Protein backbone atom coordinates (compact mmCIF):
# COMPACT_ATOMS: atom_id res chain seq x y z
CA UNK A 1 0.00 0.00 0.00
CA UNK A 2 3.07 2.26 0.55
CA UNK A 3 1.53 5.74 0.58
CA UNK A 4 -1.51 4.46 2.41
CA UNK A 5 0.59 2.96 5.17
CA UNK A 6 2.17 6.30 6.07
CA UNK A 7 -1.31 7.67 6.60
CA UNK A 8 -2.42 4.93 9.03
CA UNK A 9 0.32 5.88 11.58
CA UNK A 10 -0.84 7.75 14.71
CA UNK A 11 1.08 11.04 15.01
CA UNK A 12 1.96 11.61 18.67
CA UNK A 13 4.41 13.85 20.52
CA UNK A 14 5.32 14.78 24.06
CA UNK A 15 6.48 18.21 22.83
CA UNK A 16 3.68 19.56 20.59
CA UNK A 17 5.56 18.70 17.38
CA UNK A 18 3.49 18.69 14.18
CA UNK A 19 4.65 15.74 12.11
CA UNK A 20 2.19 16.40 9.24
CA UNK A 21 4.72 18.04 6.94
CA UNK A 22 7.06 15.11 7.22
CA UNK A 23 4.12 12.72 6.97
CA UNK A 24 2.95 14.40 3.80
CA UNK A 25 6.42 14.26 2.27
CA UNK A 26 6.95 10.64 3.31
CA UNK A 27 3.53 9.62 2.01
CA UNK A 28 3.94 11.25 -1.39
CA UNK A 29 7.45 9.72 -1.69
CA UNK A 30 9.40 12.92 -1.19
CA UNK A 31 12.35 11.42 0.68
CA UNK A 32 14.82 14.23 0.18
CA UNK A 33 12.42 16.76 1.75
CA UNK A 34 11.42 14.28 4.41
CA UNK A 35 15.04 13.84 5.40
CA UNK A 36 15.44 17.60 5.71
CA UNK A 37 12.21 17.84 7.76
CA UNK A 38 13.39 14.98 9.99
CA UNK A 39 16.65 16.83 10.79
CA UNK A 40 14.76 20.04 11.59
CA UNK A 41 12.45 18.27 13.99
CA UNK A 42 15.30 16.47 15.76
CA UNK A 43 16.73 19.98 16.33
CA UNK A 44 13.44 21.45 17.67
CA UNK A 45 13.07 18.27 19.82
CA UNK A 46 16.51 18.64 21.39
CA UNK A 47 15.41 21.85 23.05
CA UNK A 48 16.10 25.60 22.87
CA UNK A 49 19.91 25.63 23.01
CA UNK A 50 19.96 23.09 20.13
CA UNK A 51 17.58 25.25 18.07
CA UNK A 52 19.54 28.45 18.74
CA UNK A 53 22.79 27.06 17.29
CA UNK A 54 20.93 24.75 14.86
CA UNK A 55 22.78 21.40 15.25
CA UNK A 56 22.47 18.81 18.04
CA UNK A 57 25.05 17.73 20.64
CA UNK A 58 25.02 13.95 21.36
CA UNK A 59 24.32 14.85 24.99
CA UNK A 60 20.96 16.37 24.10
CA UNK A 61 19.48 13.19 22.55
CA UNK A 62 18.76 12.22 26.18
CA UNK A 63 16.22 15.12 26.13
CA UNK A 64 14.24 13.71 23.19
CA UNK A 65 11.28 11.60 24.26
CA UNK A 66 10.61 7.98 23.46
CA UNK A 67 7.28 8.84 21.85
CA UNK A 68 8.68 11.47 19.48
CA UNK A 69 11.43 9.18 18.32
CA UNK A 70 9.06 6.28 17.97
CA UNK A 71 6.76 8.48 15.89
CA UNK A 72 9.57 9.43 13.51
CA UNK A 73 10.70 5.84 13.26
CA UNK A 74 7.13 4.59 12.72
CA UNK A 75 6.73 7.04 9.81
CA UNK A 76 10.06 6.28 8.22
CA UNK A 77 9.41 2.54 8.62
CA UNK A 78 5.90 3.07 7.22
CA UNK A 79 7.06 4.95 4.17
CA UNK A 80 9.62 2.33 3.24
CA UNK A 81 8.11 -1.19 3.56
CA UNK A 82 10.06 -1.14 6.86
CA UNK A 83 13.43 -0.58 5.03
CA UNK A 84 14.09 2.87 6.64
CA UNK A 85 14.16 4.07 10.22
CA UNK A 86 16.35 4.57 13.27
CA UNK A 87 15.34 1.18 14.66
CA UNK A 88 16.28 -0.48 11.39
CA UNK A 89 19.62 1.28 11.62
CA UNK A 90 20.15 -0.06 15.16
CA UNK A 91 19.39 -3.61 13.90
CA UNK A 92 21.91 -3.34 11.03
CA UNK A 93 24.52 -1.81 13.48
CA UNK A 94 24.04 -4.56 16.03
CA UNK A 95 24.14 -7.20 13.26
CA UNK A 96 27.58 -5.73 12.23
CA UNK A 97 28.92 -6.24 15.85
CA UNK A 98 28.62 -2.46 16.63
CA UNK A 99 31.58 -2.14 14.23
CA UNK A 100 31.10 1.29 12.52
CA UNK A 101 32.75 1.07 9.07
CA UNK A 102 31.27 -2.42 8.46
CA UNK A 103 27.87 -0.83 9.17
CA UNK A 104 28.53 2.30 7.02
CA UNK A 105 29.32 -0.04 4.13
CA UNK A 106 26.18 -2.15 4.74
CA UNK A 107 24.12 1.07 4.70
CA UNK A 108 25.67 2.26 1.35
CA UNK A 109 27.00 5.47 2.89
CA UNK A 110 30.42 4.57 1.34
CA UNK A 111 29.54 2.89 -2.05
CA UNK A 112 34.63 6.64 -0.80
CA UNK A 113 32.06 8.25 1.58
CA UNK A 114 28.87 9.41 -0.12
CA UNK A 115 28.86 13.27 -0.37
CA UNK A 116 25.73 15.07 0.92
CA UNK A 117 23.23 15.78 -0.50
CA UNK A 118 23.75 15.03 -4.23
CA UNK A 119 25.47 11.65 -3.78
CA UNK A 120 22.86 9.99 -1.49
CA UNK A 121 19.94 7.76 -2.54
CA UNK A 122 16.52 9.28 -1.66
CA UNK A 123 14.18 6.52 -2.88
CA UNK A 124 12.75 3.05 -2.32
CA UNK A 125 15.67 1.71 -4.41
CA UNK A 126 17.98 2.56 -1.39
CA UNK A 127 19.28 -0.28 0.86
CA UNK A 128 17.65 -1.22 4.18
CA UNK A 129 18.83 1.32 6.75
CA UNK A 130 20.06 3.91 4.22
CA UNK A 131 17.65 6.55 5.63
CA UNK A 132 17.31 8.74 7.50
CA UNK A 133 20.74 10.44 7.92
CA UNK A 134 22.60 11.84 10.96
CA UNK A 135 25.91 13.40 9.86
CA UNK A 136 32.00 12.91 14.37
CA UNK A 137 29.82 9.76 15.23
CA UNK A 138 28.71 9.83 18.97
CA UNK A 139 25.48 11.59 17.95
CA UNK A 140 24.19 8.82 15.73
CA UNK A 141 25.22 6.31 18.37
CA UNK A 142 23.22 8.11 21.05
CA UNK A 143 20.19 7.94 18.83
CA UNK A 144 20.36 4.15 18.42
CA UNK A 145 21.34 3.55 22.03
CA UNK A 146 18.25 5.69 22.90
CA UNK A 147 15.51 3.69 24.70
CA UNK A 148 12.92 4.28 21.99
CA UNK A 149 14.41 1.34 20.10
CA UNK A 150 16.02 -0.53 23.06
CA UNK A 151 13.85 -2.88 22.68
PDB file of C-alpha atoms in Angstrom, residues 3-151:
ATOM      1  CA  UNK A   3       1.531   5.739   0.580  1.00  0.00           C
ATOM      2  CA  UNK A   4      -1.515   4.461   2.413  1.00  0.00           C
ATOM      3  CA  UNK A   5       0.591   2.955   5.171  1.00  0.00           C
ATOM      4  CA  UNK A   6       2.170   6.297   6.074  1.00  0.00           C
ATOM      5  CA  UNK A   7      -1.310   7.674   6.603  1.00  0.00           C
ATOM      6  CA  UNK A   8      -2.416   4.933   9.032  1.00  0.00           C
ATOM      7  CA  UNK A   9       0.315   5.882  11.575  1.00  0.00           C
ATOM      8  CA  UNK A  10      -0.836   7.753  14.707  1.00  0.00           C
ATOM      9  CA  UNK A  11       1.079  11.041  15.013  1.00  0.00           C
ATOM     10  CA  UNK A  12       1.956  11.612  18.666  1.00  0.00           C
ATOM     11  CA  UNK A  13       4.408  13.850  20.523  1.00  0.00           C
ATOM     12  CA  UNK A  14       5.320  14.779  24.059  1.00  0.00           C
ATOM     13  CA  UNK A  15       6.483  18.214  22.829  1.00  0.00           C
ATOM     14  CA  UNK A  16       3.682  19.564  20.592  1.00  0.00           C
ATOM     15  CA  UNK A  17       5.562  18.695  17.378  1.00  0.00           C
ATOM     16  CA  UNK A  18       3.492  18.693  14.184  1.00  0.00           C
ATOM     17  CA  UNK A  19       4.654  15.736  12.109  1.00  0.00           C
ATOM     18  CA  UNK A  20       2.193  16.405   9.240  1.00  0.00           C
ATOM     19  CA  UNK A  21       4.716  18.042   6.942  1.00  0.00           C
ATOM     20  CA  UNK A  22       7.064  15.107   7.216  1.00  0.00           C
ATOM     21  CA  UNK A  23       4.118  12.723   6.972  1.00  0.00           C
ATOM     22  CA  UNK A  24       2.952  14.399   3.797  1.00  0.00           C
ATOM     23  CA  UNK A  25       6.423  14.264   2.267  1.00  0.00           C
ATOM     24  CA  UNK A  26       6.948  10.639   3.315  1.00  0.00           C
ATOM     25  CA  UNK A  27       3.526   9.621   2.007  1.00  0.00           C
ATOM     26  CA  UNK A  28       3.936  11.245  -1.388  1.00  0.00           C
ATOM     27  CA  UNK A  29       7.455   9.716  -1.686  1.00  0.00           C
ATOM     28  CA  UNK A  30       9.400  12.920  -1.194  1.00  0.00           C
ATOM     29  CA  UNK A  31      12.345  11.416   0.679  1.00  0.00           C
ATOM     30  CA  UNK A  32      14.824  14.234   0.184  1.00  0.00           C
ATOM     31  CA  UNK A  33      12.421  16.765   1.745  1.00  0.00           C
ATOM     32  CA  UNK A  34      11.421  14.282   4.409  1.00  0.00           C
ATOM     33  CA  UNK A  35      15.038  13.841   5.400  1.00  0.00           C
ATOM     34  CA  UNK A  36      15.439  17.596   5.707  1.00  0.00           C
ATOM     35  CA  UNK A  37      12.211  17.841   7.756  1.00  0.00           C
ATOM     36  CA  UNK A  38      13.393  14.976   9.987  1.00  0.00           C
ATOM     37  CA  UNK A  39      16.650  16.827  10.794  1.00  0.00           C
ATOM     38  CA  UNK A  40      14.759  20.035  11.588  1.00  0.00           C
ATOM     39  CA  UNK A  41      12.451  18.268  13.994  1.00  0.00           C
ATOM     40  CA  UNK A  42      15.304  16.468  15.761  1.00  0.00           C
ATOM     41  CA  UNK A  43      16.731  19.978  16.332  1.00  0.00           C
ATOM     42  CA  UNK A  44      13.444  21.449  17.666  1.00  0.00           C
ATOM     43  CA  UNK A  45      13.075  18.269  19.817  1.00  0.00           C
ATOM     44  CA  UNK A  46      16.511  18.637  21.392  1.00  0.00           C
ATOM     45  CA  UNK A  47      15.411  21.847  23.052  1.00  0.00           C
ATOM     46  CA  UNK A  48      16.103  25.597  22.866  1.00  0.00           C
ATOM     47  CA  UNK A  49      19.906  25.629  23.008  1.00  0.00           C
ATOM     48  CA  UNK A  50      19.962  23.092  20.132  1.00  0.00           C
ATOM     49  CA  UNK A  51      17.580  25.252  18.067  1.00  0.00           C
ATOM     50  CA  UNK A  52      19.544  28.451  18.737  1.00  0.00           C
ATOM     51  CA  UNK A  53      22.788  27.060  17.291  1.00  0.00           C
ATOM     52  CA  UNK A  54      20.931  24.746  14.858  1.00  0.00           C
ATOM     53  CA  UNK A  55      22.775  21.403  15.254  1.00  0.00           C
ATOM     54  CA  UNK A  56      22.466  18.812  18.039  1.00  0.00           C
ATOM     55  CA  UNK A  57      25.045  17.726  20.640  1.00  0.00           C
ATOM     56  CA  UNK A  58      25.016  13.951  21.357  1.00  0.00           C
ATOM     57  CA  UNK A  59      24.320  14.847  24.989  1.00  0.00           C
ATOM     58  CA  UNK A  60      20.956  16.369  24.096  1.00  0.00           C
ATOM     59  CA  UNK A  61      19.480  13.191  22.553  1.00  0.00           C
ATOM     60  CA  UNK A  62      18.762  12.223  26.185  1.00  0.00           C
ATOM     61  CA  UNK A  63      16.215  15.122  26.128  1.00  0.00           C
ATOM     62  CA  UNK A  64      14.239  13.711  23.193  1.00  0.00           C
ATOM     63  CA  UNK A  65      11.276  11.596  24.264  1.00  0.00           C
ATOM     64  CA  UNK A  66      10.614   7.984  23.459  1.00  0.00           C
ATOM     65  CA  UNK A  67       7.282   8.842  21.852  1.00  0.00           C
ATOM     66  CA  UNK A  68       8.676  11.468  19.484  1.00  0.00           C
ATOM     67  CA  UNK A  69      11.426   9.180  18.317  1.00  0.00           C
ATOM     68  CA  UNK A  70       9.065   6.281  17.966  1.00  0.00           C
ATOM     69  CA  UNK A  71       6.757   8.481  15.886  1.00  0.00           C
ATOM     70  CA  UNK A  72       9.573   9.432  13.512  1.00  0.00           C
ATOM     71  CA  UNK A  73      10.700   5.840  13.261  1.00  0.00           C
ATOM     72  CA  UNK A  74       7.129   4.586  12.715  1.00  0.00           C
ATOM     73  CA  UNK A  75       6.731   7.043   9.806  1.00  0.00           C
ATOM     74  CA  UNK A  76      10.062   6.283   8.216  1.00  0.00           C
ATOM     75  CA  UNK A  77       9.408   2.540   8.621  1.00  0.00           C
ATOM     76  CA  UNK A  78       5.905   3.067   7.218  1.00  0.00           C
ATOM     77  CA  UNK A  79       7.060   4.950   4.175  1.00  0.00           C
ATOM     78  CA  UNK A  80       9.618   2.334   3.242  1.00  0.00           C
ATOM     79  CA  UNK A  81       8.111  -1.195   3.562  1.00  0.00           C
ATOM     80  CA  UNK A  82      10.056  -1.142   6.862  1.00  0.00           C
ATOM     81  CA  UNK A  83      13.426  -0.576   5.033  1.00  0.00           C
ATOM     82  CA  UNK A  84      14.094   2.872   6.638  1.00  0.00           C
ATOM     83  CA  UNK A  85      14.164   4.071  10.215  1.00  0.00           C
ATOM     84  CA  UNK A  86      16.348   4.567  13.270  1.00  0.00           C
ATOM     85  CA  UNK A  87      15.337   1.175  14.660  1.00  0.00           C
ATOM     86  CA  UNK A  88      16.281  -0.475  11.386  1.00  0.00           C
ATOM     87  CA  UNK A  89      19.622   1.277  11.620  1.00  0.00           C
ATOM     88  CA  UNK A  90      20.153  -0.064  15.161  1.00  0.00           C
ATOM     89  CA  UNK A  91      19.388  -3.611  13.902  1.00  0.00           C
ATOM     90  CA  UNK A  92      21.912  -3.336  11.028  1.00  0.00           C
ATOM     91  CA  UNK A  93      24.515  -1.811  13.477  1.00  0.00           C
ATOM     92  CA  UNK A  94      24.040  -4.564  16.031  1.00  0.00           C
ATOM     93  CA  UNK A  95      24.142  -7.195  13.259  1.00  0.00           C
ATOM     94  CA  UNK A  96      27.579  -5.733  12.234  1.00  0.00           C
ATOM     95  CA  UNK A  97      28.920  -6.235  15.850  1.00  0.00           C
ATOM     96  CA  UNK A  98      28.618  -2.460  16.635  1.00  0.00           C
ATOM     97  CA  UNK A  99      31.585  -2.143  14.225  1.00  0.00           C
ATOM     98  CA  UNK A 100      31.098   1.288  12.523  1.00  0.00           C
ATOM     99  CA  UNK A 101      32.751   1.071   9.070  1.00  0.00           C
ATOM    100  CA  UNK A 102      31.269  -2.420   8.464  1.00  0.00           C
ATOM    101  CA  UNK A 103      27.875  -0.833   9.170  1.00  0.00           C
ATOM    102  CA  UNK A 104      28.527   2.296   7.023  1.00  0.00           C
ATOM    103  CA  UNK A 105      29.322  -0.042   4.127  1.00  0.00           C
ATOM    104  CA  UNK A 106      26.179  -2.149   4.737  1.00  0.00           C
ATOM    105  CA  UNK A 107      24.119   1.074   4.699  1.00  0.00           C
ATOM    106  CA  UNK A 108      25.667   2.265   1.346  1.00  0.00           C
ATOM    107  CA  UNK A 109      27.003   5.470   2.888  1.00  0.00           C
ATOM    108  CA  UNK A 110      30.421   4.566   1.344  1.00  0.00           C
ATOM    109  CA  UNK A 111      29.535   2.895  -2.052  1.00  0.00           C
ATOM    110  CA  UNK A 112      34.626   6.638  -0.800  1.00  0.00           C
ATOM    111  CA  UNK A 113      32.062   8.253   1.576  1.00  0.00           C
ATOM    112  CA  UNK A 114      28.869   9.405  -0.118  1.00  0.00           C
ATOM    113  CA  UNK A 115      28.856  13.270  -0.371  1.00  0.00           C
ATOM    114  CA  UNK A 116      25.733  15.075   0.924  1.00  0.00           C
ATOM    115  CA  UNK A 117      23.235  15.785  -0.496  1.00  0.00           C
ATOM    116  CA  UNK A 118      23.749  15.032  -4.227  1.00  0.00           C
ATOM    117  CA  UNK A 119      25.468  11.653  -3.782  1.00  0.00           C
ATOM    118  CA  UNK A 120      22.856   9.987  -1.494  1.00  0.00           C
ATOM    119  CA  UNK A 121      19.936   7.765  -2.544  1.00  0.00           C
ATOM    120  CA  UNK A 122      16.524   9.283  -1.662  1.00  0.00           C
ATOM    121  CA  UNK A 123      14.178   6.516  -2.877  1.00  0.00           C
ATOM    122  CA  UNK A 124      12.755   3.055  -2.320  1.00  0.00           C
ATOM    123  CA  UNK A 125      15.673   1.709  -4.410  1.00  0.00           C
ATOM    124  CA  UNK A 126      17.978   2.561  -1.385  1.00  0.00           C
ATOM    125  CA  UNK A 127      19.279  -0.279   0.861  1.00  0.00           C
ATOM    126  CA  UNK A 128      17.654  -1.222   4.176  1.00  0.00           C
ATOM    127  CA  UNK A 129      18.827   1.320   6.754  1.00  0.00           C
ATOM    128  CA  UNK A 130      20.059   3.905   4.219  1.00  0.00           C
ATOM    129  CA  UNK A 131      17.654   6.552   5.629  1.00  0.00           C
ATOM    130  CA  UNK A 132      17.311   8.737   7.497  1.00  0.00           C
ATOM    131  CA  UNK A 133      20.739  10.441   7.924  1.00  0.00           C
ATOM    132  CA  UNK A 134      22.596  11.838  10.959  1.00  0.00           C
ATOM    133  CA  UNK A 135      25.909  13.402   9.863  1.00  0.00           C
ATOM    134  CA  UNK A 136      31.998  12.906  14.366  1.00  0.00           C
ATOM    135  CA  UNK A 137      29.821   9.760  15.227  1.00  0.00           C
ATOM    136  CA  UNK A 138      28.709   9.831  18.971  1.00  0.00           C
ATOM    137  CA  UNK A 139      25.482  11.594  17.954  1.00  0.00           C
ATOM    138  CA  UNK A 140      24.195   8.823  15.729  1.00  0.00           C
ATOM    139  CA  UNK A 141      25.219   6.309  18.369  1.00  0.00           C
ATOM    140  CA  UNK A 142      23.220   8.113  21.048  1.00  0.00           C
ATOM    141  CA  UNK A 143      20.186   7.941  18.835  1.00  0.00           C
ATOM    142  CA  UNK A 144      20.363   4.155  18.419  1.00  0.00           C
ATOM    143  CA  UNK A 145      21.338   3.547  22.031  1.00  0.00           C
ATOM    144  CA  UNK A 146      18.251   5.691  22.900  1.00  0.00           C
ATOM    145  CA  UNK A 147      15.510   3.689  24.698  1.00  0.00           C
ATOM    146  CA  UNK A 148      12.915   4.282  21.989  1.00  0.00           C
ATOM    147  CA  UNK A 149      14.414   1.341  20.096  1.00  0.00           C
ATOM    148  CA  UNK A 150      16.017  -0.532  23.063  1.00  0.00           C
ATOM    149  CA  UNK A 151      13.853  -2.877  22.683  1.00  0.00           C
TER     150      UNK A 151
END
